[PDB]
Amino acid sequence: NFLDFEQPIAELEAKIDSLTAVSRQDEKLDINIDEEVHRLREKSVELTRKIFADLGAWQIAQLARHPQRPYTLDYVRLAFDEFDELAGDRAYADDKAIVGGIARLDGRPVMIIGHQKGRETKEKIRRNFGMPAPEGYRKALRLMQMAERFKMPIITFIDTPGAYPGVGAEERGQSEAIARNLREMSRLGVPVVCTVIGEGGSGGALAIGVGDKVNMLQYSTYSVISPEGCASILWKSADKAPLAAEAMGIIAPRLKELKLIDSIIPEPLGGAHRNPEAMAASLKAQLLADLADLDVLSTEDLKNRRYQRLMSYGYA
Amino acid sequence: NFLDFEQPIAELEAKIDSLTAVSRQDEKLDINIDEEVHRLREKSVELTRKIFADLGAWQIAQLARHPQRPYTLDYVRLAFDEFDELAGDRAYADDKAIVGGIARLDGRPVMIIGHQKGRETKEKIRRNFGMPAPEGYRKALRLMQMAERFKMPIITFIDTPGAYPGVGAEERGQSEAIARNLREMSRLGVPVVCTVIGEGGSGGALAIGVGDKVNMLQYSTYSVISPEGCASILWKSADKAPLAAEAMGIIAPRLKELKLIDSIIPEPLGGAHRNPEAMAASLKAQLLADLADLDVLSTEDLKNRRYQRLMSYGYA
Amino acid sequence: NRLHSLLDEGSLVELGSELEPKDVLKFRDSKKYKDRLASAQKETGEKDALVVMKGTLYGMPVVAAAFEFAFMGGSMGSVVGARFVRAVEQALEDNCPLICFSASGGARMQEALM
Amino acid sequence: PRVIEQTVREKLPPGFQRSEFLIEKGAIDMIVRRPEMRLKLASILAKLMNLPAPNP
Numbered sequence: 001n002f003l004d005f006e007q008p009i010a011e012l013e014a015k016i017d018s019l020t021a022v023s024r025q026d027e028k029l030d031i032n033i034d035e036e037v038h039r040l041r042e043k044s045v046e047l048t049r050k051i052f053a054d055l056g057a058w059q060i061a062q063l064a065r066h067p068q069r070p071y072t073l074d075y076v077r078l079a080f081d082e083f084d085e086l087a088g089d090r091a092y093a094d095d096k097a098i099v100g101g102i103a104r105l106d107g108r109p110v111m112i113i114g115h116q117k118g119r120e121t122k123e124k125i126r127r128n129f130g131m132p133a134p135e136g137y138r139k140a141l142r143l144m145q146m147a148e149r150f151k152m153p154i155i156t157f158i159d160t161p162g163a164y165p166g167v168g169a170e171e172r173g174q175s176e177a178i179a180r181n182l183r184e185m186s187r188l189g190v191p192v193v194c195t196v197i198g199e200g201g202s203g204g205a206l207a208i209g210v211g212d213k214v215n216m217l218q219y220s221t222y223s224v225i226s227p228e229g230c231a232s233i234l235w236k237s238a239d240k241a242p243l244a245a246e247a248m249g250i251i252a253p254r255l256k257e258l259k260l261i262d263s264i265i266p267e268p269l270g271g272a273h274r275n276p277e278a279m280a281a282s283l284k285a286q287l288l289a290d291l292a293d294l295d296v297l298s299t300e301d302l303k304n305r306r307y308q309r310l311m312s313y314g315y316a
Numbered sequence: 317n318f319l320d321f322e323q324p325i326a327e328l329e330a331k332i333d334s335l336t337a338v339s340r341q342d343e344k345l346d347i348n349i350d351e352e353v354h355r356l357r358e359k360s361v362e363l364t365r366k367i368f369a370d371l372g373a374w375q376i377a378q379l380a381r382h383p384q385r386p387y388t389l390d391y392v393r394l395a396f397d398e399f400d401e402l403a404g405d406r407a408y409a410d411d412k413a414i415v416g417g418i419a420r421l422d423g424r425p426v427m428i429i430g431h432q433k434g435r436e437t438k439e440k441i442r443r444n445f446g447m448p449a450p451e452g453y454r455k456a457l458r459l460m461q462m463a464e465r466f467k468m469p470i471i472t473f474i475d476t477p478g479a480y481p482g483v484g485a486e487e488r489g490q491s492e493a494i495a496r497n498l499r500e501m502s503r504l505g506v507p508v509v510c511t512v513i514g515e516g517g518s519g520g521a522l523a524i525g526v527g528d529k530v531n532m533l534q535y536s537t538y539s540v541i542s543p544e545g546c547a548s549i550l551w552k553s554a555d556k557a558p559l560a561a562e563a564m565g566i567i568a569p570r571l572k573e574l575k576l577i578d579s580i581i582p583e584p585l586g587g588a589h590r591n592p593e594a595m596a597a598s599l600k601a602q603l604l605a606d607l608a609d610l611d612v613l614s615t616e617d618l619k620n621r622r623y624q625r626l627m628s629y630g631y632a
Numbered sequence: 633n634r635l636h637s638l639l640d641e642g643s644l645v646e647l648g649s650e651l652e653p654k655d656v657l658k659f660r661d662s663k664k665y666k667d668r669l670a671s672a673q674k675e676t677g678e679k680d681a682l683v684v685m686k687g688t689l690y691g692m693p694v695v696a697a698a699f700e701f702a703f704m705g706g707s708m709g710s711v712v713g714a715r716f717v718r719a720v721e722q723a724l725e726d727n728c729p730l731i732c733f734s735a736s737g738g739a740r741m742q743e744a745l746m
Numbered sequence: 747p748r749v750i751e752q753t754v755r756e757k758l759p760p761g762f763q764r765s766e767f768l769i770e771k772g773a774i775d776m777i778v779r780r781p782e783m784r785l786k787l788a789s790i791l792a793k794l795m796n797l798p799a800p801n802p
């Protein structure tokens with residue numbers, strides 16, 4: 001289930017995990033497990049450090065879509081508490097690709113909206129691999145309005161390959177729903193903080209991502225179009241996707257230096273999948289620090305500051 | 317195409333219409349058409365007066381659903397001008413059972429929303445016999461909001477057998493859509509006047525009928541449930557529907573004396589189908605008179621008066 | 633041409649005409665983005681896709697705008713949004729409806745997230 | 747439409763994403779031809795702004 005370039009680490013982990021079982025496997029073997037496990041872990045850590053010292057925009061994309069990575073549910077469980085899931089768009093259905101709800105954080109209730117992908121293949125099929133139908137965006141609009149009503153802070157997550165290009169999505173006003181979202185979210189009276197956990201972008205994800213603060217993970221990409229699509233359009237070939245990724249600058253440092261985000265959230269060594277708990281701790285600390293200073297502003301001044309930052313968009 | 321009890325009038329009209337053609341039919345016949353036509357018209361008028369002197373709640377229902385009667389489009393054409401039809405619910409479809417749009421009346425633009433049934437069988441099938449799907453109600457909500465925005469008066473019509481009890485209607489939040497309509501329409505800042513042209517009721521029609529004024533035609537019924545349904549439920553038999561209609565009081569005088577409406581709009585003798593133009597003139601005069609006095613009120617005082625009239629509902 | 637067709641003659645007033653493509657990303661496609669920028673600019677004779685002209689309609693003042701599709705699929709640049717905001721500001725300070733006619737193949741990729 | 751074709755790997759509905767179709771699916775208000783467009787826009791703006799209608 002690992003990527004192409006993760007073979008030196010992969011081989012050694014097929015031997016470290018067994019040693020715990022070998023402690024009482026059979027034949028009365030209780031070998032000197034401790035020292036061998038520690039040595040193998042040292043070797044694996046050194047190999048991982050050497051491998052991930054060299055990083056590439058394609059490697060960045062692969063880690064952003066590694067098929068083992070904390071989704072919105074994982075970050076909610078491992079960084080928030082008392083999460084009550086609210087569903088329903090009031091209109092047609094409750095699309096699984098967006099998960100929203102209300103939770104408490106350090107005694108302060110918050111509204112959490114973000115996409116969810118799924119670990120197993122069945123869950124990935126059920127959640128449409130994180131591609132939101134328009135009714136999901138309407139649900140997000142409703143939740144944001146509800147949070148606006150009861151003076152509630154809003155913190156949202158952005159982990160989605162792209163807005164679903166399906167027959168039903170186009171039949172049901174995809175562009176209309178996204179525009180309606182993008183209009184109201186510029187009138188909210190509460191702070192909006194967003195994170196780019198996993199892989200997010202494609203413009204459609206911006207319907208829950210126009211706020212006072214924007215943050216990105218170390219191994220996350222946020223592009224207007226998918227690198228494969230960009231290659232197949234501009235380079236007239238799909239296999240030149242790594243070249244398109246290098247040219248675009250979808251990697252975290254490129255999008256940070258372009259003054260489009262606030263800060264890059266560091267990951268545990270080995271990426272987020274190796275130690276999701278440390279990643280959750282870092283994300284919790286970052287979001288708490290970001291929410292701390294923002295709450296000082298009053299609603300009118302907050303909206304005015306957001307509007308001025310809205311004008312700050314673009315080079316011209 | 318006439319009802320059961322309209323046989324004396326029906327026979328004579330099969331001879332009056334021919335005399336115009338007989339004026340140059342064949343064989344050089346140009347008989348003394350004028351006097352015979354006038355005598356036959358006198359006889360037909362006297363028979364119609366005698367027949368409609370005796371009226372019954374069932375007869376009231378039959379005239380309310382006579383398969384020849386001015387619908388919303390007819391009243392718009394023959395009483396309003398410069399009608400621009402706006403369609404689309406922005407969500408799923410544009411259900412034909414509700415026709416809405418914006419038109420000018422005596423130099424003042426108005427918003428016209430009302431159900432439409434159809435004359436031919438094909439049109440009746442296409443319009444679902446005036447049964448609105450929930451998306452139509454969402455469209456009506458959108459149009460009412462638009463009229464509220466640009467300080468525009470709203471005048472609506474109610475001619476529908478009942479909210480559509482279909483699979484799709486229930487699948488798509490029928491009750492939710494009607495409730496959403498009924499909540500917003502109590503917050504509009506502009507007067508709302510409604511008419512009960514044709515046959516309307518069943519509760520669902522009230523989603524466009526909660527306003528400062530309510531008016532009814534002389535041969536129209538406005539009931540909570542359909543008389544046939546009321547019979548089949550309470551009397552355990554469908555054929556006792558006329559008895560249920562008599563007991564309920566769906567006829568215009570009963571609903572007028574119950575202080576639920578403002579005034580009964582008279583019809584041309586012979587009902588509305590005999591002279592739809594005179595009916596349109598009466599309806600235009602009534603709506604103009606009703607709109608005249610209401611426009612004096614300011615928006616805040618108008619909403620307060622509507623709320624007080626909202627409290628005035630019910631016996632307790 | 634669309635603006636001329638809609639707006640009355642003798643009232644065309646272009647707004648925000650000083651803005652021009654000022655590329656800052658230096659994109660490296662199969663062709664350099666400057667190549668396509670210059671080609672479109674010299675072909676269409678216009679600075680960007682959006683064209684703004686405050687006019688008057690039947691005695692009623694009105695603002696108008698339109699997208700030139702030939703400008704690399706009429707993509708929305710920073711100049712496009714800034715000119716739209718300028719038209720909105722003119723409408724707010726001088727009360728009049730705003731009209732925009734949409735024609736775009738999508739967002740300008742070579743300007744990325746901007 | 748090519749992206750949707752590669753996504754659903756099937757056939758688009760007839761008249762896909764046409765103004766006639768998209769007004770059926772409620773996302774489109776009205777279909778107006780260009781020769782009528784000037785008068786229609788003037789009338790609609792005059793009504794919405796509550797201004798007197800243009801003289802034609």
Ligand SMILES: CC(=O)SCCNC(=O)CCNC(=O)[C@H](O)C(C)(C)COP(=O)(O)OP(=O)(O)OC[C@H]1O[C@@H](n2cnc3c(N)ncnc32)[C@H](O)[C@@H]1OP(=O)(O)O
Nearest residue numbers: 203224225704705706707736737738739740741742747749
């Ligand atoms: C993700 C985004 O927002 S941009 C993604 C691209 N756009 C889309 O996916 C939506 C529609 N996709 C399309 O391909 C078209 O817009 C369609 C379907 C309307 C087809 O219209 P067409 O007649 O094929 O126009 P076409 O795509 O050729 O546009 C003309 C030119 O504009 C260019 N163009 C159009 N949109 C863009 C864009 N967003 N960025 C850069 N160039 C663009 C094309 O490259 C083309 O250039 P070329 O003729 O010199 O090669």
